[PDB]
UniProtKB/Swiss-Prot annotation, chain A:
A Pfam family matched in the record: Ribosomal_L3
Keyword hit for Ribonucleoprotein: yes
Xref: NCBIfam families: L3_arch, PRK04231.1
PANTHER family: 60S RIBOSOMAL PROTEIN L3-RELATED, LARGE RIBOSOMAL SUBUNIT PROTEIN UL3
Protein name: Large ribosomal subunit protein uL3
Assigned GO CC terms: cytosolic large ribosomal subunit
Gene from which the chain derives: rpl3
Organism this protein belongs to: Pyrococcus furiosus (strain ATCC 43587 / DSM 3638 / JCM 8422 / Vc1)
UniProtKB/Swiss-Prot annotation, chain B:
Biological processes annotated in GO: cytoplasmic translation
Gene Ontology MF terms: rRNA binding; structural constituent of ribosome
Protein source organism: Pyrococcus furiosus (strain ATCC 43587 / DSM 3638 / JCM 8422 / Vc1)
PANTHER family: 60S RIBOSOMAL PROTEIN L17
Domain of life according to the entry: Archaea
Name listed for the protein in its UniProt record: Large ribosomal subunit protein uL22
Keyword Ribosomal protein among record annotations: yes
GO cellular component, one term: cytosolic large ribosomal subunit
Family annotation (SUPFAM superfamilies): Ribosomal protein L22 (SSF54843)
Family stated for the protein in its record: Belongs to the universal ribosomal protein uL22 family.
Gene: rpl22
Alphabetic keyword roster: Ribonucleoprotein, Ribosomal protein, RNA-binding, rRNA-binding
Subunit structure of this chain's protein: Part of the 50S ribosomal subunit.
Gene3D superfamilies xrefs: Ribosomal protein L22/L17
HAMAP family: Ribosomal_uL22_A (MF_01331_A)
Swiss-Prot record, chain C:
Protein's gene: rpl35ae
Alphabetized UniProt keyword annotations: Ribonucleoprotein, Ribosomal protein
One of the GO biological process terms: translation
PANTHER family named among the record's database cross-references: 60S RIBOSOMAL PROTEIN L35A
GO MF, one annotated term: structural constituent of ribosome
Family designation: Belongs to the eukaryotic ribosomal protein eL33 family.
Organism classification: Archaea, Methanobacteriati, Methanobacteriota, Thermococci, Thermococcales
One Gene Ontology cellular component annotation held by this UniProt entry: ribonucleoprotein complex
Ranges annotated as spanning the membrane: none
Protein name (database record): Large ribosomal subunit protein eL33
Subunit structure: Part of the 50S ribosomal subunit.
Swiss-Prot record, chain D:
Keyword Ribonucleoprotein applies: yes
Organism lineage: Archaea, Methanobacteriati, Methanobacteriota, Thermococci, Thermococcales
Matching HAMAP family: Ribosomal_uL13
Gene3D superfamilies, per the entry: Ribosomal protein L13 (3.90.1180.10)
Pfam families the record matches: Ribosomal_L13
Organism: Pyrococcus furiosus (strain ATCC 43587 / DSM 3638 / JCM 8422 / Vc1)
Similarity comment: family membership: Belongs to the universal ribosomal protein uL13 family.
Protein name: Large ribosomal subunit protein uL13
A molecular function (GO) term: mRNA binding
Example of a GO biological process term: negative regulation of translation
Domain of life: Archaea
Role: This protein is one of the early assembly proteins of the 50S ribosomal subunit, although it is not seen to bind rRNA by itself. It is important during the early stages of 50S assembly.
Keywords for this protein: Ribonucleoprotein, Ribosomal protein
UniProt KW Lipoprotein keyword: no
Subunit structure: Part of the 50S ribosomal subunit.
Length: 365, 150, 87, 142
RNA sequence: CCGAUAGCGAACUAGUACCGUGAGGGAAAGCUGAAAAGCACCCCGGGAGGGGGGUGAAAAGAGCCUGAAACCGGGCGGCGAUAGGAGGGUGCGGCCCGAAAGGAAUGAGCCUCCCCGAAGGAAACCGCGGCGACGCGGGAGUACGAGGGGAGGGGACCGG
RNA sequence: CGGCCGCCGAGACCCCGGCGCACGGACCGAUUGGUCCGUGAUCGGGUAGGCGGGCGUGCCGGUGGCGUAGAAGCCGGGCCG
RNA sequence: AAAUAGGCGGCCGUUCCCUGGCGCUUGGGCCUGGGCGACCGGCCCAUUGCCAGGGACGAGGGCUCGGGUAGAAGACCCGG
């Protein structure tokens, strides 16, 4: 010992480094309620671009041109399958009951020439059929018995706590899956009855980027990061190099530990899973919301996007979209969910609708 | 010899193999797996093993060998040699049983058990002037099949 | 008929057993004084199925109304919990 | 068998009487763990309890003493430590024991009668904490 | 005297196989059956392999008299995927069996009444003390008690 | 901390029956040994070591037996010590 | 796999016959004397239920195939 200190390499604060429990992200932690408005929304990562904006975004100038890298994400429209009710227990929050909607509209769906058998796809949500969640077996009956169950819960009255929504995707242009990913999003207000009224209107409705979320806010992003596979002590934790020239060593930890203690600590660098880990990254600026892409008839607030030739490893973008600042956790083609920020910076104010000087139109290749 | 009860006139048919030059451990996994089936299923099972389709799960001896997908135990491997060899034993019970007045296809396999026989032994080189045993195990496997029908 | 009837341990120091005798609390007995009516009464461990352990009590344990009992055989311990009859 | 309402009753005395009865093979259910009392200077009580939790037995193998943060579990751990959960009888006993959080029961409780050391008079006893307060500070729920 | 891991280096293919440049060094390896009848004939099998039938008797079927232990497969009984460790002793449950060498139908596990009875030894209840915890006298050396005897009922295992 | 009372709690100690040893008494035998009775509260842990009794193995001799209607040997069970 | 071994919504399994023997064995209603009641006794019903002999049906899921946003095997994810 030189009596010199070495600060720890790797964190145990994003540990243990091991595979996600589902491809869907999970959630316990919900951001601030202050409005009767939808919390949390979803997309698929399309690719990346870079953008020129006018500051806005308070920092080292508030008027010169600024480069900001951007993640273009195709969001599907979503369809609220059901209303999930909670009751507060003694030990934690438990789900009282649910209303689902077995009941069937025909889906805004397209596809397919050949032609002789168009073979109708007219979608009762045959995408529910492709979803491996099962269904009664008397559509009308079930919905009503549940609705009555809801009416009870609303009546009692304070037995019932808050309302969250079982919400699922609609793949209606995306070729990377055709089976609803099913999730939970909360519906916040400030008191149960206002959430109960809103969720009930919502259920039959195909909804937008616009409904959920506003431009110029800072947002959290929740996602399962891209899977590397197993990677080394070098990669996972960070390791420094050593003395004059070592053939034998090089990628090595030396000591795992002393002789007594007669054990291995869990904080010493080893190989194992890297990636395919869940991460919430805070405070990403909403550059933009629009729909299409490729052409828009107005010339300010975009003129419309999409590089020609697509993107490497992503299909055609044509549906509602969001362009969010900087890095998004995950791989190309992975489902990401978006979470409003719980609190954003306060030494740096949010400023609504940030000024978008120019958008890229070159391919990533 | 034979290591189980007999009633060969009209309810059992038997055959045995001696000094098959095969792994005894791989005979352990097939005998257990195969045990309790009818002959026809047993043919079908062996034919799949040879194709390299259905795995034979490793169980009692199992160490340091890769897993195999599906229902059945984690590790498993395919003993092609043994499957061919045992197929001949089974074929012999089948031809014999027919002379005996049993119909083979219906008869269930009560008992199949493997015996580690004599050991073919010698030497192959290692370093430092030394020679070490280099051995092939020679195995006997018996099969006694029994009628069951209504 | 029977009055319950609890085997809590053997007479034992923290470190020794004494396998020979067991300590019992009968229910009703508050005191050393009540327990003596139980003296000589036969205690039976019943177990599922039929095998049968008789013993008698033969001595007062308490203080508060415990009684000690001896068996022909002894008790596993497996039952800490037996029954005593009003014979 | 037994429903104890354990409002107003010192933890050690209550936990002994219960631990013994469970070994007899007779169920006790303790209700209202929180409403319970621990006598002594609060600094020390907290410090003692905190310290158990603080480990880091090695640096986390997920073995070694742990202690939980809620008044319920603090108590559930206590009656169990009075029990010999390693042996057959003790183990059987731990299943015989249940703690309930709040009161869910509609039925009346029971008590350990004596006022020597097993029921407080809050004015008479110079120094106490209620067990729920030390649990809130530790991080658990009232 | 020894009796085939013994006795001569060596019961035999021994001073062989083999080692070492050489001088020299140096093992292991015994048993069919009455008769070879040493496996024909018949079925099967690529098959010189292997299985059934064929011998007084094939755990007499070819280093074949007997045929242990370690150990390996299968099967039977028991345990068995929440729980503690010199792997057991001692005591008792569950399951399991036990015809045979043991005692017991001329009565087993078991039930019940009566008496004798070593050391030991109460209570209820009564009267009087002790600040109290509790103690004395009488009940009473009684009830009880290891151990011993007789009778009586039931009807199969009990030890192990 | 200074008193006190009731209990719990050893293989100790008490107590029934048995066993060995030591010693006395008697008897029995062809030798060694054995048996029967009495005494022991003041006999009964145990390494080095000393002594004393029994057991088993191989073969020899005398004597007196067994075996294909099943020896030795092998494996499991029953009984005695 | 938190042994206080969780919560929800949906999906599933959720059986027959002859012949013999039994039924306050199983289940309900009524009257009256006894009971707070369960219960005894009296009255009424069962396509029924039970034992012995033979007997149906099969939700989920993998394996399979084309590829990966996944990956040492195995797993994972998607499409068929």
């Amino acid at each position: 010992m030189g009596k010199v200190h070495r600060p720890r390499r790797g964190s145990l604060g994003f540990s243990p480094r091991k595979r996600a429990k589902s491809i869907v992200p999970r959630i316990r932690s919900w951001p601030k309620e202050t409005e009767v408005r939808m919390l949390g929304f979803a997309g698929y990562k399309a690719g990346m671009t870079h953008i020129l904006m006018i500051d806005d975004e308070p920092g080292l100038t508030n008027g010169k041109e600024i480069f900001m890298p951007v993640t273009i994400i195709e969001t599907p429209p979503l369809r609220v399958f059901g209303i999930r009710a909670y009751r507060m227990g003694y030990l934690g929050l438990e789900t009282a009951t649910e209303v689902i909607v077995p009941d069937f509209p025909l889906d805004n769906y397209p596809a397919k020439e050949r032609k002789g058998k168009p073979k109708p796809k007219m979608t009762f949500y045959k995408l529910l059929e492709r979803r491996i969640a099962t269904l009664p077996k008397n559509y009308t009956q079930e919905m009503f018995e549940q609705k009555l169950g809801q009416l009870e819960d609303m009546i009692k009255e304070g037995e019932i706590v808050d309302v969250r929504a079982i919400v699922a995707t609609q793949p209606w242009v995306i070729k990377l899956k055709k089976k609803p990913e099913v999730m939970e999003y909360a519906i916040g207000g400030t008191s149960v009855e206002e959430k109960f009224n809103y969720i009930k209107e919502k259920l039959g409705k195909e909804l937008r980027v616009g409904e959920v979320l506003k431009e110029g806010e800072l947002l959290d992003v929740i996602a399962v990061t891209k899977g590397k596979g197993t990677q080394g002590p070098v990669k996972r934790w960070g390791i420094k190099l050593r003395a004059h020239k070592d053939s034998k060593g090089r990628r090595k930890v030396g000591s795992i530990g002393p002789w007594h203690p007669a054990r291995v600590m869990w904080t010493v660098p080893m190989a194992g899973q890297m990636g395919f880990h869940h991460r919430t990254e805070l405070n990403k600026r909403l550059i933009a919301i629009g729909e299409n892409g490729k052409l828009k008839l107005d010339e300010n607030t975009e003129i419309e996007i999409t590089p020609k030739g697509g993107f490497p490893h992503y299909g055609i973008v044509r549906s509602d979209f969001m362009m969010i600042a900087g890095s998004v956790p995950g791989a190309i083609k992975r489902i990401i969910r978006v979470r409003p920020a719980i609190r954003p910076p306060k030494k740096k104010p949010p400023v609504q609708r940030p000024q978008i000087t120019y958008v890229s139109v070159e391919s990533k290749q | 010899g034979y290591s189980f009860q007999n009633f060969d006139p009209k309810r059992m048919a038997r055959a045995s193999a001696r000094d098959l030059r095969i792994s005894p451990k791989l005979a352990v996994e097939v005998c257990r797996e195969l045990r309790g089936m009818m002959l026809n299923d047993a043919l079908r099972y062996l034919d799949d093993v040879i194709a390299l389709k259905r795995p034979v799960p490793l169980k009692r001896y199992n160490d340091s060998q890769g897993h195999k997908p599906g229902k059945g135990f984690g590790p498993g491997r395919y003993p092609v040699k043994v499957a061919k060899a045992i197929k001949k034993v089974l074929l012999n019970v089948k031809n014999n049983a027919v002379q005996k007045g049993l119909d083979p296809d219906k008869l269930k396999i009560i008992h199949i058990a493997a015996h580690k026989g004599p050991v073919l032994r010698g030497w192959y080189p290692r370093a430092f002037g030394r020679a070490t045993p280099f051995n092939e195990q020679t195995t006997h496997i018996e099969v006694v099949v029994e009628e069951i029908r209504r | 008929m029977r009055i319950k009837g609890v085997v809590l341990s053997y007479r034992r120091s923290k470190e020794n057993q004494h396998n020979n005798v067991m300590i019992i609390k009968p229910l009703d007995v508050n005191s050393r004084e009540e327990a003596s009516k139980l003296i000589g009464r036969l205690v039976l461990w019943k177990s599922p199925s039929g095998k049968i352990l008789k013993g008698k009590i033969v001595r007062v344990h308490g203080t508060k109304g415990a009684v000690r009992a001896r068996f022909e055989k002894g008790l596993p311990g497996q039952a800490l919990g037996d029954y005593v009859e009003i014979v | 068998m037994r429903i104890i309402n354990a409002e107003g009753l010192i933890l050690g005395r209550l936990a002994s009487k219960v631990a013994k009865m469970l070994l007899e093979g007779e169920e006790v259910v303790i209700v209202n763990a929180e409403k319970a009392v621990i006598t002594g200077n609060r600094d020390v009580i907290f410090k003692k309890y905190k310290q158990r939790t603080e480990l880091r037995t090695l640096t986390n193998p997920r073995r070694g003493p742990f202690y939980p943060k809620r008044s319920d579990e603090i108590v559930r751990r206590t009656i169990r430590g009075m029990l010999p959960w390693k042996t057959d009888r003790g183990r059987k006993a731990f299943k015989r024991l249940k703690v309930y959080v709040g009161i869910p029961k509609e039925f009346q409780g029971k008590e350990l009668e004596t006022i020597i050391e097993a029921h407080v008079s809050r004015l008479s006893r110079p120094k106490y904490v209620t067990v729920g307060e030390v649990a809130k500070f530790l991080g658990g729920k009232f």
